[PDB]
Design a protein around this ligand. Structure first.
Ligand SMILES: [Mg+2]
Ligand SMILES: [Mg+2]
Ligand SMILES: [Zn+2]
Ligand SMILES: [Zn+2]
Ligand SMILES: [Zn+2]
Ligand SMILES: [Zn+2]
Ligand SMILES: [Zn+2]
Ligand SMILES: [Zn+2]
Ligand SMILES: [Zn+2]
Ligand SMILES: [Zn+2]
Ligand SMILES: [Zn+2]
Ligand SMILES: [Zn+2]
Lengths: 131, 505, 505, 131
RNA sequence: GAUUAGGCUAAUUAUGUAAUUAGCCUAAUCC
RNA sequence: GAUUAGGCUAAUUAUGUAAUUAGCCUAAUCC
């Protein structure tokens, strides 16, 4: 009964994230210690002519970005644990997330370690020109 | 990789996968969205926006190694070292039903302390906006072996209420014993899945109010505390886990436990399983293998108890050897061959089970051995024999007294921890039917230089007098004897011993 | 007092009361602790320390009067003034089961906007250390009428999500309408029980960003905001409550609503209950009774709309009287007996429904007067008759157009609020089958002192010319006519009307 | 089903406390304006020979005090609402509270508007002599 | 209901065979 | 599952009767 979702190679770190007090630091320490980053992320085929904002309803990726599914690059969705927001709603689920092409090795880690700018909705340091 | 796992399995009865923006993994995407390049396509399609899919928590593995994070699935050798923190743990579960199928949810949690917690069936539900840890539909397992779980489906409490109860019970059990909590399990899979409901892990932390190691975590306060300061806390922090089934056992728990122990029997509840699991672990670590290289730190009045035991031993053996004028002494269990008393001139012989000196023999006393040392006195200080001879002086630990250095054991025995872990067989009074209780008395012959006691054998007390030299010494022997007797030791002697003989010496 | 109430009823299944130190009231204390002096005694008895008891929230009564605190259960006469704030409200509930029995919890919440929210069953649990609001076990009510509630039992969301969704929906509905929120309810008991989950009350407060009255409360920020600034807020602050059942109604909601309305029918959901409740309240306050003494403030372009409507009336009636040269006019619904056009010399007669002047009549036009007034023209500026005659000039508000001055009404009608509230029956195009839609044009005859338009009837446009005196006036008429048309007013005229006749006048 | 707990005469103020942002202020405002104080508290039979401390695990009432059950004099326990403590734990439940005999008309209001001293455990102004 | 091992069938990929996935049967343990 | 109204029974209190509480039945509304 049921349908399988995750690979065994992702089973350890997710288990760790399911038990830690602070999951974000746990995943970052796991990856920075030489652990393998998460896989099985949903990558989208894109004609590469988008606007380049961080989070969007439809895939909008430029020549230097790749589009991922929103739930695939959220650690709390991957581990099926409680989200840290007081509203309780994930900001990634149901939307598409643009990742720079030099950070596609760890999209989950990139989303954990970065936030979009409030006014232009681009990544801070990767598209935000609010000098 | 390519090998899939049952962890986080989608247990919903839906016939279709999720859209790329809502699916958590690539495998979870419906195949109509997929292309040949392991890439998804945002098709022009409507989506099942509101959904609720039960996610399986079965299949955890805490094997990852990160610097700064302790290893929680400890080995056998560390479990023997942390034996004071051993708590048996068993979970009986319920099967997800109705709108979900393919996962199990904890129903009854039992610990070796004898306490059961009944919880409402709660699982993880993925929705269109996030995750929820909420009550789900569940049914008891089919079969007569699980028929007692049917009433428990209407007595479950909420998980945030049960977490604090578990923390409080564990803090009450282990506060004066250990800074740690080691869950002793059998077939640890569902145990770990259930432990995800009330345990938190991380780096090792100090208590916010003292220097003890933190053992509980408070999520409203976001703080860490030891067992003493853990009131109101709702999570167990950094517990150790031990799987007895991985120690080379075949069959189920019940047949393995029944082979060695005949005391832990009763109704089928999770607490009885936990007690049986801890009993089997104790038997495996301290009876099947007896390694005495492990030294355990003192936590109480133990050093003092050893000296009191030696003092009481010297006095009692002096009185017993003097009375009756037996000139032959046999000491069973001595690993050093050193006599306790030397004032009466008597012959000495030494025996031990595992001696490390050629002066001491390897005799194993069973029952026949009474007529061979019939000519003298036989010493059984801290030696356990199910049949003591008529001419013996015996000191046996009462396993029914519970203390910080006495733990429950196997088949009515007890684990006694005094710089070492000795397993002492159950205290049967039928092994002393050939002997008598030793009365309380004192005897000395030191020169002298108010207290009144009829049993105080003393040169002054022959004429009814008393002196400070013996008045303080009797009080010292009094506190030593009281400590030894309240610690759980009992003394036995041959039936012809009497106090009034000591007046003649 | 001595009358007990069902509020805070102990819904647990335990068979005994609590100890004096744990019971909240004297009634809840077990009888073994009580004496004859209405005093309790602390016995030397063990206490069942870990307990959990479900506490009922059914039976709230907000009838307390405290200075500085507004009255929230308003009566009918102020509800009529706050009519712009009216939101229907209905809750469909679930029964506590398993470990509890004797209380209901909200399951589905519905509003007259048409939105339904589904929630987890959450109740109050009394613990030996205090209170906690958490999920409890609940089942749908038995019976065929509630079979649609069975699927929703595992489809809900967490209450913190639903609170912010409710606040967002209410902010969207009432931002440009009012500073307040009035919940229009039927059998307000369980509605108030559910409102305890998402409403906060207190003294009247000001918005933290502007001068508007605060309608939402943010507990993470502990701040107050109006509808415009309530983004992310999670509580409704100081709402009004109205119970329509207390307005003298017998039977249930459905048979009372169906007696007056035929358009609010559908499946059995909470939103349909709420829509029916609001429709019944509208019918009770604005059809059954007509109290036009109540004055409403302006919130938008109403004073401009009146002048534009008067200008359009003068132009259209002037053109209609000039075309065909009818010498007799019957103006229905005029309560003042004042004509709008006087340049053509025609005879005038006036009628009204509830007038206050002896020069006018009290005719109730139904169908039969079509041959009574065929000798002239009949004026129907803002009068509601289901059959307009062949010789009429009619203005009818389109009830399907929704604006700030147009609220939903009863039986497909609408409530038009311009200083006073008029209930206009539904706009049926089949009542104009004896007339024609009025084509747009402009007509004037002022002396003169580039613009081009074929419908601009003007002495210059007869030769194809144009002047500023008419060019500016024609742009003003476009403004006025465009406002009037966009507001929701439709014009109808007799079938023999044509613009080209006005060239001769 | 179930067993009744409270009187109807207390149903008004408790309902108010269940809806207000500040329950303590609302209760004090209600009783200050002339509203009746809460009744049906758990008064204890005592020998009138005690230490006189504010909160105790056994009734310790002197000649000038009366002892009540702790949960019966706590407004948050009475209204079954959230306690102000972050951990949610009541300081009164499961213990006995000594109220001065000149303040027994409103025990709940007295416990709301007073605190015990942190070193001597007496009521400040009603037994505490920490000069 | 869950996992592990074995057998059978089908599909995909790779170079007659191997790996993975899905389904069925047997055994053990867990529920 | 909740409340209101009515009837019956029992208990307590007060002075043949009254009030309150608890249980059962009928009706109405809510779920
Ligand atoms: Mg078991
Ligand atoms: Mg309804
Ligand atoms: Zn997420
Ligand atoms: Zn920016
Ligand atoms: Zn501590
Ligand atoms: Zn055993
Ligand atoms: Zn002496
Ligand atoms: Zn504002
Ligand atoms: Zn209607
Ligand atoms: Zn002109
Ligand atoms: Zn309290
Ligand atoms: Zn003080």
């Amino acid at each position: 009964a049921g349908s399988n979702t995750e690979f065994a190679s992702n089973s350890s770190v997710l288990s760790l994230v399911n038990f830690t007090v602070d999951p974000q630091k746990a995943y970052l320490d796991f990856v920075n210690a030489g652990g393998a980053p998460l896989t099985n992320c949903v990558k989208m085929l894109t004609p590469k002519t988008g606007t380049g904002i961080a989070i969007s309803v439809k895939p909008e990726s430029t020549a230097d970005q790749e589009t991922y599914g929103g739930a695939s690059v959220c650690l709390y969705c991957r581990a099926h644990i409680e989200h840290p927001d007081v509203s309780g709603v994930c900001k990634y689920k149901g939307k598409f997330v643009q990742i720079p092409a030099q950070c596609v090795r760890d999209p989950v880690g990139f989303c954990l370690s970065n936030t979009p700018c409030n006014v232009c909705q681009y990544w801070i340091g990767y598209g935000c020109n609010c000098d | 990789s390519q090998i899939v796992t049952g962890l986080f399995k989608d247990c919903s009865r839906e016939t279709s996968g999720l859209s790329p923006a809502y699916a958590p993994t690539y495998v979870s995407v419906d195949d109509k969205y997929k292309t040949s390049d392991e890439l998804c396509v945002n098709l022009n399609l409507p989506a099942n926006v509101p959904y609720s899919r039960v996610i399986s928590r079965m299949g955890f593995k805490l094997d990852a190694t990160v610097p700064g994070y302790p290893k929680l699935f400890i080995t056998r050798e560390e479990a023997v070292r942390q034996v004071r923190s051993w708590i048996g743990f068993d979970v009986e579960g319920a099967h997800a039903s109705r709108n979900a199928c393919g996962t199990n949810v904890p129903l009854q949690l039992g610990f070796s302390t004898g306490v059961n917690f009944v919880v409402q069936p709660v699982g993880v539900v993925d929705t269109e906006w996030g995750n929820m840890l909420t009550g789900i539909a569940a049914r008891p397992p089919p079969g007569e072996q699980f028929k007692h779980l049917v009433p428990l489906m209407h007595k479950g409490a909420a998980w945030p209420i049960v977490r604090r109860r578990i923390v409080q019970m564990l803090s009450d059990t282990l506060d004066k014993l250990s800074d740690y909590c080691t869950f002793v399990c059998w077939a640890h899979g569902f145990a770990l899945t259930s432990a995800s409901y009330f345990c938190k892990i991380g780096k090792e932390q100090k208590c916010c109010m003292c220097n003890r190691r933190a053992a509980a975590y408070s999520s409203p306060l976001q703080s860490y505390a030891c067992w003493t300061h853990s009131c109101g806390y709702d999570y167990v922090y950094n517990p150790f886990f031990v799987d007895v089934q991985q120690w080379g056992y075949v069959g189920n728990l019940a047949t393995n436990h029944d082979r060695y122990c005949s005391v832990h029997q009763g109704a089928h509840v999770a607490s009885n399983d936990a007690i049986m699991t801890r009993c089997l672990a104790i038997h495996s670590c301290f009876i099947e293998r007896v390694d005495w290289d492990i030294e355990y730190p003192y936590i109480s009045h133990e050093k003092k108890l050893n000296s009191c035991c030696r003092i009481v031993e010297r006095n009692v053996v002096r009185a017993a050897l003097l009375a009756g004028s037996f000139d032959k002494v046999y000491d069973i269990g001595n690993p050093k061959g050193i006599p306790i008393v030397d004032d009466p001139v008597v012959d000495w012989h030494y025996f031990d089970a595992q001696p490390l000196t050629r002066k001491v023999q390897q005799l194993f006393y069973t029952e026949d051995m009474a007529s061979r040392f019939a000519d003298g006195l036989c010493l059984f200080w801290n030696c356990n024999v199910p049949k003591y001879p008529n001419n013996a002086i015996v000191c046996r630990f009462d396993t029914r007294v519970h203390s910080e250095f006495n733990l429950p054991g196997c088949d009515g025995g007890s684990l006694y921890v005094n710089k070492h872990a000795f397993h002492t067989p159950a205290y049967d009074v039928s092994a002393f039917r050939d002997l008598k209780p030793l009365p309380f008395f004192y005897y000395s012959t030191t020169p002298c230089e108010p207290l009144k006691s009829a049993v105080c054998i003393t040169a002054c007390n022959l004429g009814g007098a008393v002196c400070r030299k013996h008045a303080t010494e009797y009080r010292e022997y009094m506190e030593a004897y009281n400590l030894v007797s309240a610690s759980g030791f009992r003394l036995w002697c041959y039936k012809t011993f009497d106090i009034y003989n000591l007046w003649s010496t």
